[PDB]
């Protein structure tokens, strides 16, 4: 264009005007906060001590640091503030949030409604924590296909609920329905991790209070800080655009660039403005008070074989009083392992041998294939509960195939064998890494890790309980686009107990990264871990033996 190159002073004159603008607005905000330097003390000038959780927070006593977290979020309410709970992973931000909701309901008579927006991969966990910790709090889970969400719209429109639990996707897609509601509180769980969503909330959603859950401290990313600032403190700049868009609106045409020191200049001011509204405690400073056992739901993918069989079964079933209970059972066999159907095993594994098909065909086995070595490599010992005995046979084949030493106990086990199996497992130097247990058939306090494979311990140790659930399956309903599951890094974050283990977990993830078959390093085949559609013949896509399978 008209760029006589010495005009670069024109971009710089615009950048200086834009930076100066950002500094004076944030200075005005801080000047105002201090007029009514310790900005925390002046922001939280109204105190209220919290000594005990609400009576309706049932099923667990808050830890001391969780009580102080509840007290801090209550200070946001009393002082008419928005805020950010940035506690490190493992401090129970989910539980603290439910403690805030119950406390506001019980003590302050704030019935709701409460808007809780969570990563799809943790939705099921959230739903479960609400059922355990706050059963009296009326809850709507807003997810699924459009015909499943229409059944909610009546209850939602009438306001006959207190908590609406949903994901970012439906906040955007179903805004015409959800933005009609006058929300009391909007809580956004950004996971540990942290586009369109911020604009949708800024323009259409009416809430009286806002809270962000994050797992990291305030970062050095301008885009993320900017998005946080404009959600927590929307009136300073009143813009739904990203930082880059906001910064470059003068030329709405080349991107104005900030020097390294200009970026740091902007980052520190945005940090300073947000600090009085941020609470973050570290695991190392509350280590003595950390809880006894914590439970996490882990969502698992379907393999292409499971997905194919599942769609076919469901279709055949809709064509058709406990014959409906049988259909539900068939879907549950699939979610556990396709090979529980003998016909599927014969077609897929005609050689009738133990190989990588054991874990490539079942999303739960493929997950266990990754995390069981991590536990083994960090000194832990695993109890595994099964509702279906038939899956225990397949698990035995897989464990033997991986060389993992286990014991097994079910209703077939004779009474004197049960005691001997327990005695062996409880031994100090037991070579047995795992205990396979039928839930129908105990003092297993040498194991600190518990995996509930499906559904219908520990000595002074952090006991961890994992509940495996197939995404988008009948298993989700029984427990009652966006990435349905979490990746290895996020998985390492919630399975590792300290920093020494997280390093061990990551070292194993890099060793797998260089596997000749499944690795993604250069010189590796890059074969997918879960079976893919191209690996399947034209089966289960009319055929009688496949309808008996669906309703058996």
Positions in the binding site for ligand KH2 (CB under 6 A): 77-78, 80-82, 208-210, 233, 268-269, 272, 355-356, 517, 527
Q: Residue 110 or residue 198: which is nearer to Na ion going by CB?
A: 198
Q: Is 231 in the site for Na ion (CB under 5 A)?
A: yes
Q: Which of ligand KH2, Na ion, none does residue 341 bind to, with CB < 5 to 8 Å depending on kind?
A: none
Question: Is the CB of 233 or the CB of 344 nearer to Na ion?
Answer: 233
With respect to Na ion, which residue has the nearer C-beta, 211 or 399?
A: 211
Minimum CB separation from Na ion for residue 225, in Å? Answer: 11
b/e map 441-464, b = 16+ CB within 10 Å: eeebebbbbbbbbbeebbeebbbb
Q: What does 527 interact with, of Na ion, ligand KH2, none (CB < 5 to 8 A by kind)? A: ligand KH2
- Give the span between the Cα atoms of 367 and 373, in whole angstroms: 11
Nearer to ligand KH2, 99 or 152 (CB): 99
Length reported for the chain? 552
- Is residue 520 classed as helix, strand or coil in its secondary structure? coil
3-state secondary structure 452-515: ECCCCCCCCCCEEEEEEEECCCHHHHHCCCCCCCCCHHHHHHHHCCCHHHHHHHHHHHHHHHCC
- Window 209 to 228, contacts with Na ion (CB under 5 A): 227
Q: What is the DSSP letter of 514?
A: T
Residue 210: which of Na ion, ligand KH2, none does it interact with, CB under 5 to 8 A by kind?
ligand KH2
Q: For residue 390, what are its two tokens?
A: 């038939």
Return the number of the residue (57 or 273) whose C-beta is nearest ligand KH2: 273
Residue 258 near residue 250 (C-beta atoms within 8 A): no
Which lies closer to Na ion via its Cβ, residue 201 or residue 327?
201
- How many separate helices (H) and strands (E) can be counted in the chain? 23, 13
Q: Which does 517 bind (CB under 5 to 8 A by kind): ligand KH2, Na ion, none?
A: ligand KH2
**In the window 140-199, what residues touch Na ion (CB under 5 A)?**
198
Q: Toward ligand KH2, which CB reaches closer, 356 or 462?
A: 356
Handedness of CA 142, 465, 186, 67 (dihedral sign): positive
- Asked if residue 277 binds Na ion (CB under 5 A), the reply is no
Read off the tokens for 252.
Answer: 């709405």
Residue 256 interacting entry, from Na ion, ligand KH2, none, C-beta within 5 to 8 Å by type: none
User: Could you give the 3-state DSSP secondary structure of residue 55?
Assistant: coil
Per partner kind, with CB cut-offs from 5 to 8 A, the member of ligand KH2, Na ion, none near residue 231 is Na ion
Tell me the DSSP string of 58-98. -SSPPPHHHHHHHHHHHHHHHTT--EEE-PPTTS-HHHHHH
- 355's contact among Na ion, ligand KH2, none, with CB below 5 to 8 A by partner kind, is ligand KH2
CB of 329 to Na ion, least distance (A): 42
CB of 76 to ligand KH2, least distance (A): 8
Binding residues (CB under 5 A) for Na ion: these are 198, 227, 231
């Amino acid at each position: 264009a008209n760029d006589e190159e010495a005009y670069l002073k024109l971009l710089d004159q615009a950048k200086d005007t834009r930076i100066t603008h950002l500094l004076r607005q944030t200075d005005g905000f801080l000047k105002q906060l201090a007029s009514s330097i310790d900005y925390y003390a002046v922001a939280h000038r109204i105190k209220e001590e919290v000594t005990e959780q609400a009576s309706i927070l049932v099923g667990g006593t808050l830890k001391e640091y969780q009580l102080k977290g509840l007290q801090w979020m209550l200070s946001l309410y009393n002082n008419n503030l928005n805020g950010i709970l940035a506690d490190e992973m493992g401090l129970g931000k989910t539980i603290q949030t439910i403690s805030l909701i119950t406390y506001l309901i019980e003590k302050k008579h704030q019935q709701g409604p409460y808007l809780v927006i969570v990563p799809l991969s943790t939705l099921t966990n959230w739903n479960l924590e609400f059922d355990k910790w706050a059963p009296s709090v009326a809850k709507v889970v807003y997810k699924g296909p459009p015909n499943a969400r229409k059944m909610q719209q009546e209850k939602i429109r009438q306001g006959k609920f207190q908590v609406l639990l949903t994901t970012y996707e439906y906040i955007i897609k179903d805004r015409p329905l959800l933005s009609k509601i006058k929300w009391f509180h909007m809580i956004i769980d950004e996971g540990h991790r942290m586009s369109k969503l911020s604009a949708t909330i800024q323009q259409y959603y009416s809430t009286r209070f806002r809270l962000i859950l994050t797992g990291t401290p305030l970062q050095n990313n301008l885009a993320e800080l900017w998005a946080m600032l404009n959600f927590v403190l929307p009136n300073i700049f009143k813009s739904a655009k990203t930082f880059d868009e906001w910064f470059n609106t003068p030329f709405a045409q080349d991107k104005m660039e900030l020097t390294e020191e200009e970026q740091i200049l902007v980052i520190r001011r945005l940090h300073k403005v947000l600090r009085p509204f941020l609470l973050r405690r570290l695991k190392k400073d509350v280590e003595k008070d950390l809880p006894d056992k914590t439970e996490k739901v882990i969502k698992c993918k379907f393999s292409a074989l499971q997905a194919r069989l599942y769609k076919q079964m469901v279709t055949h079933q809709k064509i058709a009083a406990r014959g409906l209970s049988n259909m539900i059972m068939q879907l549950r066999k699939l979610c556990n392992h396709p090979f529980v159907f003998d016909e599927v095993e014969n077609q897929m594994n005609p050689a009738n041998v133990s190989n990588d098909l054991l874990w490539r065909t079942a999303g739960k086995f493929e997950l266990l294939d990754r995390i069981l070595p991590k536990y083994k490599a960090t000194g832990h010992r695993v109890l595994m509960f099964f509702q279906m005995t038939a899956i225990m046979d397949i698990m035995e084949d897989f464990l033997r195939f991986r060389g993992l030493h286990y014991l097994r106990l079910d209703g077939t086990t004779k009474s004197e064998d049960r005691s001997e199996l327990l005695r062996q497992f409880n031994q100090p130097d037991s070579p047995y890494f795992m205990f396979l247990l039928s839930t129908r058939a105990l003092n297993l306090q040498t194991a600190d890790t518990v995996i509930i494979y499906d559904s219908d311990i520990g000595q002074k140790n952090e006991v961890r309980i994992l509940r495996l659930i197939s995404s988008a399956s009948v298993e989700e309903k029984i427990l009652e686009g966006e990435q349905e599951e979490m990746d290895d890094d996020e998985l390492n974050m919630i399975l590792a107990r300290n920093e020494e283990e997280l390093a061990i977990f990551q070292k194993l993830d890099e060793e797998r990264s260089r596997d000749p078959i499944y690795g993604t390093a250069p010189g590796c085949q890059g074969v997918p871990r879960l079976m893919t559609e191209d690996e399947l013949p034209d089966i289960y896509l009319p055929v009688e033996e496949e309808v008996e399978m669906a309703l058996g």
